[PDB]
Design a protein around this ligand. Structure first.
Ligand SMILES: *Cc1cc2c(nc3c(=O)[nH]c(=O)nc-3n2C[C@H](O)[C@H](O)[C@H](O)COP(=O)(O)OP(=O)(O)OC[C@H]2O[C@@H](n3cnc4c(N)ncnc43)[C@H](O)[C@@H]2O)c(*)c1C
Ligand SMILES: *[C@@H]1O[C@H](CO)[C@@H](O[C@@H]2O[C@H](CO)[C@@H](O[C@@H]3O[C@H](CO)[C@@H](O)[C@H](O)[C@@H]3O)[C@H](O)[C@H]2NC(C)=O)[C@H](O)[C@H]1NC(C)=O
Ligand SMILES: COc1cc2c(cc1O)[C@@H]1Cc3ccc(OC)c(O)c3CN1CC2
Ligand SMILES: *[C@@H]1O[C@H](CO)[C@@H](O)[C@H](O)[C@H]1NC(C)=O
Ligand SMILES: [Mg+2]
Length: 495
């Protein structure tokens, strides 16, 4: 039995499947499901849930599962857009990493070791508690897990200054298919490259990341201002925004959340400056006076405060609450990367479509800055110089709106089709943290498909990784030749 192996090896925190609706099993299962779309009774459920409390327990958990016929599923923060950390078409064991949430800050080296169950919020909180002059570049959502996020890159409000989370990883502990405990030196440079953006659930189980902490001023300046406007003005704002955003010096970021409802358009402008408010306002007065920002819009605060504020949290303390409900809605999302400026009519049509579906919203980010100075092959995320914007389309709904699911998904499909001519093409680019199964998927139990796995997987592989796809395959073959870590879009090993 799996349990007997786990016990012989000192892993005690485990719970087998139970039909009891409010069993402990179900409590643990649902605790970290961050997309309600995959919560219902018709979804696949794990045969057991294991909560390892140490790297040794993680190693032995993997070793035991292998003595059986199980598919391994790793979950850190549970934010997978496609629920790939807690679903599987084959019988599976869920390894939940929530107990591995220790952050160890070394102020003498200005680095940190971060267990992979730690959320972004927990990490940010730990950093701000330790120092007023250090921060880290990662995503905007505080409940996202470092396990999946850093594995896939990790883009956020300081990426124009410092790049992705993965661009600032200097060591890691990877537990491989045989339970080996491997640091950077042990896994080798190809594998250490692959894990820094090559996607979660593919290489082994990351136990911990070693990150370089980055300088921040004791006071940064942010704004969070929602413009309530009509479509003509919203269109001209977004059309100018794209140029301001990509062209801003690296010490500034201007991003947008947007939506609409008939004649009313809302654009939430999210601003960040690595410095004081005089310089911040001088810059936006010059470059984007159309925003109509006023002195009272600019707030000076600590870096930690700024990340809580930009995400709409009440306090810095809230960063440290991994179970704080950030957004309890089922959702589907798609993303585009661009290479050419978007014409005005693209924003106009996007806004028209938003006005017809108030449950939809967009998130807009400029690249440029440091993102253009990092080589396309420095880490697996290839969208560097030449990449102008990242454009996210989201539709989300609560339980009372479930009847409209098909309609919501149809709306999103049509938005993505509308944007096709304006965004990257040949191929249409994507981002592995924004995993999208519409691109297709591999059934690893299907021999004819597996025989041709490399060609088949190119569909999504090249969209996520472009020319880096080849090295990823070589790295996969080195570290997981038997494909113990797999999912519908995992990098294939060579046969
Ligand atoms: C829900 C959500 C996601 C967001 C949000 N904001 C983002 C942002 O501002 N920038 C971004 O770059 N991404 C943002 N995303 C998307 C997330 O980045 C991705 O959804 C992350 O991959 C999520 O990571 P995590 O929360 O850990 O999700 P899981 O579902 O647990 O795992 C994803 C994937 O990775 C594997 N995996 C988890 N843990 C490990 C370890 N330790 N080792 C190897 N592999 C691991 C899983 O098996 C799965 O395959 C904002 C919001 C609200
Ligand atoms: C396996 O891991 C789970 C998840 O961490 C463990 O459950 C957790 O146990 C801790 C310690 O008992 C709980 O801490 C306390 O919770 C109570 C409220 O219920 C509170 O009074 C204390 O101040 C503290 O918060 C924690 O709630 C709980 N977490 C969850 C989500 O259940 C569990 O102990 C482990 N199981 C085994 C067999 O080791
Ligand atoms: C399920 O509900 C949500 C889903 C998602 C987000 C927020 C939600 O509430 C965030 C919103 C957001 C805001 C600003 C960003 O850059 C500054 C950004 O990249 C994102 C990304 N997305 C990822 C999808
Ligand atoms: C394998 O996959 C192919 C292509 O998706 C499918 O047509 C076929 O039915 C599958 N074969 C088996 C035996 O499952
Ligand atoms: Mg009961």
């Amino acid at each position: 039995d799996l349990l007997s192996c786990l016990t012989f090896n000192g892993v005690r925190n485990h719970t087998v499947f139970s039909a009891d609706s409010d069993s402990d099993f179900n409590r643990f299962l649902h605790l970290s499901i961050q997309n309600p779309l995959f919560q219902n009774s018709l979804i696949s459920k794990p045969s057991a849930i294991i909560l390892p409390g140490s790297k040794e327990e993680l190693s032995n958990t993997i070793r035991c599962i292998r003595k059986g016929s199980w598919t391994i599923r790793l979950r850190s923060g549970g934010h997978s857009y496609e629920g790939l950390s807690y679903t599987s078409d084959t019988p599976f064991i869920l390894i939940d990493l929530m107990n591995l949430n220790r952050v160890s800050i070394d102020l003498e080296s200005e680095t940190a070791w971060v267990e992979s169950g730690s959320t972004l919020g927990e990490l940010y909180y730990a950093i701000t508690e330790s120092s007023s002059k250090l921060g880290f570049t990662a995503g905007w959502c505080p409940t996202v897990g470092t396990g999946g996020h850093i594995s896939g890159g990790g883009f956020g409000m300081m990426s124009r200054k410092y790049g992705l989370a993965a661009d600032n990883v200097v060591d890691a502990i990877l537990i491989d298919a045989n339970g080996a405990i491997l640091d950077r030196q042990a896994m080798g440079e190809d594998v250490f490259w692959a894990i820094r953006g090559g996607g979660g659930g593919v290489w082994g189980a990351i136990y911990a990341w070693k990150i370089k902490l980055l300088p921040v001023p004791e006071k940064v300046t942010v704004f969070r201002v929602t413009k309530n406007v009509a479509i003509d003005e919203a269109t001209s704002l977004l059309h100018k925004w794209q140029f301001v955003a990509e062209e801003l010096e690296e010490d500034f970021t201007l991003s947008v959340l947007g939506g609409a409802d008939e004649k009313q358009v809302w654009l939430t402008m999210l601003g960040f400056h690595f410095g004081l408010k005089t310089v911040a306002k001088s810059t936006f007065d010059l470059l984007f006076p159309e925003l109509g920002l006023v002195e009272e819009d600019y707030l000076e605060m600590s870096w930690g405060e700024s990340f809580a504020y930009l995400a709409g949290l009440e306090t810095v303390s809230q960063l440290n609450n991994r179970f704080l409900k950030f957004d309890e809605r089922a959702f589907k999302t798609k993303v585009d990367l661009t290479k050419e400026p978007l014409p005005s009519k693209a924003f106009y049509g996007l806004l028209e479509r938003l006005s017809k579906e108030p449950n939809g919203f967009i998130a807009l980010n400029g690249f440029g800055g440091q993102m253009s100075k990092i080589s396309s092959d420095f880490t697996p995320f290839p969208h560097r110089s030449g990449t102008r914007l990242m454009v996210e389309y989201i539709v989300a709904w609560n339980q009372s709106e479930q009847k409209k699911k098909t309609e919501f998904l149809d709306w999103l499909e049509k938005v993505y089709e509308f944007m096709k001519p304006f965004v990257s093409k040949n191929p249409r680019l994507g981002y592995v943290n924004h995993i999208d199964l519409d691109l297709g998927g591999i059934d690893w139990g299907n021999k004819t498909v597996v025989n041709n796995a490399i060609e088949i997987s190119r569909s999504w592989g090249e969209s996520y990784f472009l020319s880096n796809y080849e090295r990823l395959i070589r790295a996969k073959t080195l570290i997981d030749p038997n494909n113990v870590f797999n999912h519908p879009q995992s990098i294939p090993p060579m046969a």
